[PDB]
Design a protein around this ligand. Structure first.
Ligand SMILES: COc1cc(-c2cncc(-c3ccc(C4CCN(C)CC4)cc3)c2C)cc(OC)c1OC
Ligand SMILES: COc1cc(-c2cncc(-c3ccc(C4CCN(C)CC4)cc3)c2C)cc(OC)c1OC
Ligand SMILES: COc1cc(-c2cncc(-c3ccc(C4CCN(C)CC4)cc3)c2C)cc(OC)c1OC
Length: 283
């Protein structure tokens, strides 16, 4: 039996402290190849351990293909190989695309669908999973207008999260760390922020907001843990809802939904399944 494993790396589509992502080719088809820095080996191990536990398969979860460890002279090479989404991240896409009502709802309901799939325990099945680093750079846009959730390097089954998206209980270190539901409620906070980022790009009455990240007006770039704690915990600020949203029934409903993801009390926040149901009744 022939096992053709060689992947041709073609173009770098992302570089950071995590390492690099490449468009590659295997047997005539695009794949995405994440090459980990030694600094972030634990993210490869965690995502590989999760996929060795449960082979997640969902239209709104980035599709797993392979985990590879290769011995080198003086180092270990760690690759994660997935489906390739040529439209890139939601963060990328929102910069220079605006949305209509149908495309905005389709994006957010697809994210909610992927998140509820992670969060749910299925018996007889899958363990419940919290993501712990949900953000617009960790969501990819597919050609059919739905999105998928990426990067399970911090996920927990039943590195810290991106500080801009951290829930108040994470910033004030009150999170109930032994309690799995706490981690779902941290994802819901982050989902609300992503919902806000997308909703801003939905046109109503000839108006749209420019792309901005959550809290762009109250924290610096690369905000510190203290910068975030002061805004979110001490002053209890939340992202602005522009007046123009209140002329549009879809954005009026989405504003209500995002507020129900942002309660200071984590147990007051909506569940991913309740968010899905609410989105299916909008429009
Ligand atoms: C090891 O490494 C890599 C391997 C491959 C790869 C290439 N051809 C064929 C395969 C294959 C799949 C599945 C079976 C099954 C068939 C039914 N039988 C009852 C059990 C066995 C056999 C062979 C694979 C897995 C790709 C890779 O990357 C693109 C690899 O590198 C990560
Ligand atoms: C890793 O990824 C890819 C792998 C392959 C691939 C290559 N050789 C063989 C296979 C295979 C054959 C047969 C079985 C059996 C298992 C049990 N039996 C009861 C029925 C089915 C399983 C596996 C596959 C899946 C193709 C891919 O794409 C076309 C892959 O994706 C990029
Ligand atoms: C968030 O995280 C992961 C993401 C991915 C991933 C999957 N498909 C496509 C991409 C991508 C492709 C292309 C662009 C650009 C470049 C071409 N053009 C100039 C504009 C568009 C951006 C992004 C990525 C980055 C894979 C991962 O692992 C293998 C990730 O980590 C888990």
């Amino acid at each position: 039996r022939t096992v053709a494993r060689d992947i041709t790396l073609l173009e770098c589509v992302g570089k950071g402290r995590y390492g690099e992502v490449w468009r590659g080719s295997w047997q005539g088809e695009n794949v995405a190849v994440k090459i980990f820095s030694s600094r972030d080996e634990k993210s490869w191990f965690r995502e590989t351990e999760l996929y060795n536990t449960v082979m997640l398969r969902h239209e709104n979860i980035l599709g797993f293909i392979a985990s590879d460890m290769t011995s080198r002279h003086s180092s270990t090479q760690l690759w994660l190989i997935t489906h390739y989404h040529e439209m890139g991240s939601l963060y990328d896409y929102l910069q220079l695309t605006t949305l209509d009502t149908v495309s905005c709802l389709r994006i957010v309901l697809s994210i909610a669908s992927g998140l509820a799939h992670l969060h749910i325990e299925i018996f007889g099945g899958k363990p419940a999973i919290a993501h712990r680093d949900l953000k617009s750079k960790n969501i990819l846009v597919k050609k059919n207008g739905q999105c998928c959730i990426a990067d399970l390097g911090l996920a927990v089954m039943h590195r810290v999260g991106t500080k801009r998206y951290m829930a108040p209980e994470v910033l004030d270190e009150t999170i109930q760390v032994d309690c799995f539901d706490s981690y779902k409620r941290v994802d819901i906070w982050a989902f609300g922020l992503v919902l806000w980022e997308v909703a801003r790009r939905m046109v109503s009455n000839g108006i749209v907001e420019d792309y901005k990240p959550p809290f762009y007006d109250v924290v610096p770039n690369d905000p510190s843990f203290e910068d975030m704690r002061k805004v979110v915990c001490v002053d209890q600020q939340r992202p602005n809802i522009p007046n123009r949203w209140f002329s549009d029934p879809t954005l009026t409903s989405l504003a209500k939904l995002m507020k129900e993801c942002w309660y200071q009390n984590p147990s007051a926040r909506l569940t991913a399944l309740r968010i899905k149901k609410t989105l299916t009744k909008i429009d």
